[PDB]
Design a binder for these strands. Structure first.
Ligand SMILES: Nc1nc2c(ncn2[C@@H]2O[C@H](COP(=O)(O)OP(=O)(O)NP(=O)(O)O)[C@@H](O)[C@H]2O)c(=O)[nH]1
Ligand SMILES: [Mg+2]
Ligand SMILES: [Mg+2]
Ligand SMILES: [Mg+2]
Ligand SMILES: [Mg+2]
Ligand SMILES: [Mg+2]
Ligand SMILES: [Mg+2]
Ligand SMILES: [Mg+2]
Ligand SMILES: [Mg+2]
Ligand SMILES: [Mg+2]
Ligand SMILES: [Mg+2]
Ligand SMILES: [Mg+2]
Ligand SMILES: [Mg+2]
Ligand SMILES: [Mg+2]
Lengths: 242, 96, 173, 389
RNA sequence: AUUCCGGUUGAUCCUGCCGGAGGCCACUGCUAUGGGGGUCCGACUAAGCCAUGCGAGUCAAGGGGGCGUCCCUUCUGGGACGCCACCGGCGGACGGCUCAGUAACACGUCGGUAACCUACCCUCGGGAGGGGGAUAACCCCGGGAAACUGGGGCUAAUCCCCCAUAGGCCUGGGGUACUGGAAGGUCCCCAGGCCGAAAGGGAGCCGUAAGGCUCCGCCCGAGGAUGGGCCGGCGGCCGAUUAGGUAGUUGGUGGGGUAACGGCCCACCAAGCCGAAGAUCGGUACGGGCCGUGAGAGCGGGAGCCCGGAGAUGGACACUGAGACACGGGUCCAGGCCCUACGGGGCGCAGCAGGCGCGAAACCUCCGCAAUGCGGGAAACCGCGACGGGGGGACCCCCAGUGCCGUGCCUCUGGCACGGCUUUUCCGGAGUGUAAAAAGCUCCGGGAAUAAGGGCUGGGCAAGGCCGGUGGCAGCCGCCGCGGUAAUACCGGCGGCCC
């Protein structure tokens, strides 16, 4: 990138969270800008071809996508570069199967089967909150999408809360506060994919991030960053987890 | 030569079925594509004009070979999905 | 820096002309009918590697060390080099003859397939010997214990016939 | 299928050899070179269409056809030093044109050319230039001698008659019977003398039609070539080129030559085998040694034509050695055996203690070596190339 | 294998250096049967000079034309159908190549931007109202040796320009809704100004028409994502036979400029800033992940694969664009080279091949877009010397061959004579393999047939006290030393040793 943006990606330099053979070929798919970031998402082509195995080559994979066979959060996606990320839902209505994308115990992305009833909800962590013209409130989520609320409701929402959203209509149906006793799932770091309940919260001076303590099922305590803790229920999970 | 089917998997998105098989044949040459197609068609009672054999592969010191084949329910879909070279190689269409 | 370069898998002697070493190696070469010295040296290196792993693990402690310790014992007694009740100490008493006894050539000779070591070598190279249903043409292949008894003439070979003239002469001894 | 006959022009210095070819091509080459002397042999192809345009009603006097595809002219230096070039030109060509000035009579180079032609049994016709040197002569642009003669007085005609009679007598003590082209009826033992004028194109048409006609009378069956057989030709020169390396200019006269064909060429010490990489063709009506127009690359060529071959490892090629196409190892061995029956006409004698001389071609090197040897000067080394460190 | 052996004396014990014995890299003598795998092959000297071909396009669902084929009525025409260029849109700033410069915030690592830009993409909230204009293509006439280029006629758009509204930016006065560790930020209300949008466009069905119904699209705002700019602490070469260096230099106040902070640049006010814990200057060098070697502690290197930097003959400078002061785009100077009709006009392979030059030192002017990716397109698709497939090569590593058995004889390791056996390898076929081939793999027929060299031979250091030549000559010798007519040391034969 001497004069401008990069458009290519070598296999050896690909993100470490994909399931991919790094020496089989030279190039990999450089993902398009979109919802999540490079460290927590994977292009759709690898989901079609490498993970589920409905195609052998990229060319016939593009023929499936251009016919409208895959839904992500209930919306048709045709771009083979489109990123799919944490807590997203993948639906194939023709075969009638649904999956949720989740990190592994070693940090890689996997597809977890779920029921059709649960496939209509998506949990969204509140990443930021601001004031917008007309004195309305805009909520900015962990996957980059936004929502608007009136000034009357401004005290029901704070950062790190989780909103259960109905897709594709994008209508709110639940709010899960972040506090002691909440049920959390870890999405990054050394303690990735562990889950439990919140025990303590600690804070530091001068912009150092804050840390939380979590108790798991067997009674062990472990710490992590506050922003790595995803709230999934009051005292039991609201979604199916492995 | 004797044929044993190992797995048969359906693909509703493409509209085909994918078949994996083994051929056991001590003391014989590698089976031809014609013989394999005829035997495979008869065992499965499948129309022969919409059946493609992707490959037949032999190994170093084995008495058996591994094969992979595909069956399409419609001729138009087959002509639309498969590359030209695999149809020419299997005798389905004639070269230009 | 520099990219990877593939390295040799055997080690050469520190001095090429030492009388005692030459005598010992000549005895081994003649008994087991190896083609050249490097073949012998290959097997020697294998032995040393095993020893070097045992010396390192006796002096270690922690969680990974115990995993590697049991892995070493399991691999050693899967190859048929140790009895099923051996301990780590018994690794240090292995000799070169133990490894040379596991070659496919030696095993074909001991089972009675051939009358001589050289005949066994040729039997293997020309493709008359099958191991667990598969033909192997490398005389130096090390035989696992679990597959030792499925070693026979290939079912397409001329020798897989009790009336073949050369097979009868082999049975005669 | 008949190939274009090969014509070699021979003569003495300052006898209008280059000027005749320039007038035929309607291009100026004689003024280009330094010193007025041409020291490089070349091959030029003349299409039959311009031949027909130059000619006229005279073609109807002889009961034959103009089905000849064209002409392949070869120029030749007339200087004393370039003996080997003259020998090569005399041996290679099928027809010869000896150009002798009437005024000066005979020169030793003319005698040497006649000797070479006799040795290589090449039929030829005599030309006569410098007609305008006769006083009381009118000049007209491109008219035959038959049209021009009626425009002159008696004195010029009688002077011409005396001069050509003296020339015929000269050929007679050279043991050859001579008579004018329009004054003779036999065409198997008698030659023909054409009085021409290079500067004004007098009598060119008669010479051209005579060359076209006499080809099918002496021997015509040697002009039939199979159009699918292996290529067979000879080397004309070896020179360095910018960007292509050591290339050779050859005249293919048997078979058909395509790209990537394996060829056999007689080297200095032994035969050399290589695969053709580049086939380059001169523009029509253009001197091969004067690239006025851009050369056209060509995949394959058919006999007979002059082409430039660029192939690896040709730096030890011998000038005058034949080239034979061989697609199979047995063909390669047969070609090698054929090459083994070939003589090195000129060999340089080096004394190991001498001067260093370098030229751009082998022929110039041979001429320089002969001229230095004429003055008792030893020669340490001779090769082709630029002066290196 | 955490090691020793020869050499100073008539003999001895030391110090000390030289040599032998191991690994890896480059060049090279002699000699070579086979297969597989891999990140190998003009890096060291010349970042020297280059003929020819190829290495970047794509869209007919943005727009008017030309040509051809059919159908209806056709005097006309209207249709469908397919080609071709032009206008218009997006891309050409990535990918590929080399290591000259550079001892520096260039690079590694942890942090920061509340001091900043971002076309393509994602989510939510809004908008698409009214006018005008030229011009290529096409017709007439051309100029010039060519490179190029002139005038007149007519025409369209998702082309260009106005007007409105939304919107943006600056400053002054109030209010306290948001995030955050903390507001020169966001939000609301007045007031003075400046700038200032858009294509309801295209395709298909139901439409008798009216008009829907999908598909692809245009503009504004808030946020994200992607790609970057800038800043700081810490870490890693050699020289004192280089000791003082700096004067926009170090800081302050007021401005300009920038996307943005800043002596980045100005105007004024001071005398600071760095240094024997090595400043300044000189030498050599792209940095790292890594690689070679060694019991380890260490010592040496940093071409090939990945991440960062820099360059496009040397030196300076601009246009367009979201992004360049742009390798296959522009201008000047210096220096080479090419074509001219002599008036002028052009070109730099450190892209793939190929050539010359320099050297001890390095390959085919090949086939394909089938795989992996990128650009374009609604899609089917199209292009790509990237990449994939082969060709040449004692590049690295792995697995094999050059026969085996029995009975006799022999100088008993080995050689010979009889009888038998097998076919990895070799020769000829069928299948499978491959984009197509070639290799490879499974079968069939023939037959021990088609296949061993290089160095050493007095000690170190394994191996001859044999024969013939030469005669302090010729020669050998890493070191110690041999050769002076009875040479285990030179040259050759026959033996023998190592690989
Ligand atoms: N008066 C006159 N001069 C002539 C005629 N033909 C040629 N010339 C002149 O005489 C000279 C002949 O030289 P050139 O063309 O070299 O002759 P050549 O036949 O090529 N000989 P070469 O190349 O060995 O010298 C030229 O100067 C030319 O102009 C002619 O017919 N009349
Ligand atoms: Mg490096
Ligand atoms: Mg001449
Ligand atoms: Mg002393
Ligand atoms: Mg290189
Ligand atoms: Mg170079
Ligand atoms: Mg670039
Ligand atoms: Mg340098
Ligand atoms: Mg406006
Ligand atoms: Mg360095
Ligand atoms: Mg090359
Ligand atoms: Mg080399
Ligand atoms: Mg000797
Ligand atoms: Mg000894």
């Amino acid at each position: 990138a001497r004069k401008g943006p990069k458009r290519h990606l070598k296999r050896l330099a690909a993100p470490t969270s994909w399931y991919i053979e790094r020496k089989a070929y030279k190039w990999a798919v450089r993902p398009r800008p979109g919802p999540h970031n490079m460290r927590t998402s994977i292009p759709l082509l690898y989901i079609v071809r490498d993970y589920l195995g409905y195609a052998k080559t990229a060319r016939e994979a593009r023929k499936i996508l251009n016919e409208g066979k895959f839904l992500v959060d209930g919306r048709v996606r045709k771009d083979y570069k489109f990123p799919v990320g944490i807590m997203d839902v993948v639906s194939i209505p023709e075969t009638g199967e649904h999956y949720r994308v989740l990190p592994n115990r070693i940090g890689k992305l996997i597809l977890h089967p779920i029921s059709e009833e649960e496939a209509n909800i998506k949990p969204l962590r509140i990443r930021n909150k601001r004031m917008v013209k007309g004195a309305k409130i805009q909520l900015n989520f962990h996957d980059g999408t936004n929502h608007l609320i009136p000034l009357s409701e401004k005290d029901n929402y704070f950062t790190s809360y989780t909103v259960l959203m109905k897709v594709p209509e994008r209508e709110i149906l639940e709010v899960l506060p972040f506090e002691k006793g909440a049920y959390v799932f870890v999405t990054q770091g050394k303690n990735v994919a562990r889950k439990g309940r919140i025990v303590e919260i600690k804070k530091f001076p001068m912009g150092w991030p804050d840390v939380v303590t979590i108790e798991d099922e067997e009674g062990e305590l472990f710490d992590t960053l506050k922003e790595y803790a995803f709230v999934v229920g009051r005292d039991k999970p609201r979604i199916s987890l492995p | 030569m004797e044929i044993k089917i190992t797995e048969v998997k359906e693909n509703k998105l493409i509209g085909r079925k994918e078949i994996y098989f083994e051929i056991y044949h001590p003391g014989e040459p590698t089976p031809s594509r014609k013989d394999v197609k005829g035997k495979l068609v008869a065992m499965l009672d499948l129309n022969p004009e919409t059946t493609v054999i992707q490959y037949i592969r032999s190994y170093f010191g084995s008495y058996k070979s591994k094969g992979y084949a595909k069956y399409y329910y419609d001729k138009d879909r087959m002509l639309y999905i498969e590359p030209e070279y695999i149809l020419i190689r299997d005798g389905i269409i004639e070269k230009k | 820096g520099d990219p990877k370069r593939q390295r040799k898998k055997y080690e050469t002697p520190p001095h090429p002309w030492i009388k005692e070493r030459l005598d010992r190696e000549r005895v081994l070469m003649d008994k087991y009918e190896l083609k050249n010295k490097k073949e012998l040296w290959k097997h020697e290196t294998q032995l040393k590697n095993f020893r070097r792993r045992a010396r390192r693990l006796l002096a270690a402690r922690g969680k990974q060390a115990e995993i590697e310790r049991e892995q070493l014992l399991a691999r050693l007694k899967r190859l048929g080099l140790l009895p099923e009740d051996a301990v780590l100490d018994d690794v240090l008493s292995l000799t070169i003859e133990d490894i040379l006894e596991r070659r496919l050539q030696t095993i074909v000779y001991k089972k009675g397939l051939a009358r001589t070591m050289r005949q066994a070598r040729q039997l293997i190279v020309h493709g008359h010997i099958e191991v667990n249903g598969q033909i192997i043409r490398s005389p130096s292949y090390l035989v696992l214990k679990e597959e030792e008894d499925t070693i026979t003439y290939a079912r397409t070979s001329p020798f897989a016939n009790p009336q073949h003239p050369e097979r009868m002469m082999i049975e005669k001894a | 299928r008949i190939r274009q006959p090969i014509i070699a022009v021979l003569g003495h210095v300052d006898h209008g050899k280059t000027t005749l070819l320039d007038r035929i091509r309607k291009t100026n080459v004689a003024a280009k070179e330094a010193g007025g002397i041409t020291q490089h042999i070349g091959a030029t192809e003349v299409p039959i269409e311009v031949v027909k345009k130059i000619a006229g009603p005279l073609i109807k006097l002889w009961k034959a056809e103009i089905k000849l595809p064209g002409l392949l002219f070869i120029d030749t230096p007339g200087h004393e030093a370039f003996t080997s070039l003259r020998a090569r030109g005399g041996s290679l060509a099928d027809l010869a044109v000896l150009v002798v000035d009437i005024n000066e009579g005979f020169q030793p180079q003319t005698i040497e050319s006649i000797e070479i032609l006799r040795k290589y049994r090449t039929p030829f016709v005599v030309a006569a230039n410098k007609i305008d040197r006769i006083k009381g002569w009118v000049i007209e642009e491109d008219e035959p001698f038959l049209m021009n003669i009626k425009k002159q007085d008696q004195r010029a005609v009688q002077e011409l008659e005396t001069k050509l009679w003296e020339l015929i007598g000269k050929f007679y003590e050279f043991g050859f019977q001579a008579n004018r082209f329009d004054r003779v009826q036999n065409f198997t033992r008698e030659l023909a003398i054409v009085p021409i004028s290079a500067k004004y194109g007098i009598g060119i048409a008669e010479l051209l039609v005579l060359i076209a006609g006499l080809s099918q009378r002496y021997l015509e069956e040697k002009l039939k070539i199979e159009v699918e057989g292996p290529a067979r030709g000879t080397i004309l020169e070896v020179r360095e080129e910018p960007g292509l390396g050591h290339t050779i200019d050859v005249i293919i006269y048997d078979g058909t030559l395509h790209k990537d064909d394996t060829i056999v060429v007689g080297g200095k010490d032994k035969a050399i085998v290589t695969k053709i990489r580049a086939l380059l063709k001169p523009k029509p009506l253009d001197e091969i040694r004067d690239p006025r127009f851009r050369f056209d690359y060509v995949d394959e060529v058919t006999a007979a034509a002059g082409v430039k071959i660029a192939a690896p490892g040709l730096e030890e090629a011998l000038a005058g050695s034949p080239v034979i196409a061989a697609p199979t190892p047995e063909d390669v061995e047969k070609a090698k055996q054929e090459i083994l029956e070939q003589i090195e006409r000129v060999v340089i004698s080096t004394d190991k203690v001498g001067v260093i001389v370098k030229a751009d071609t082998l022929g110039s090197l041979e001429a320089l070596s002969k001229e230095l040897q004429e003055k008792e000067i030893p020669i340490r080394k001779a090769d082709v190339g630029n002066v290196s460190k």
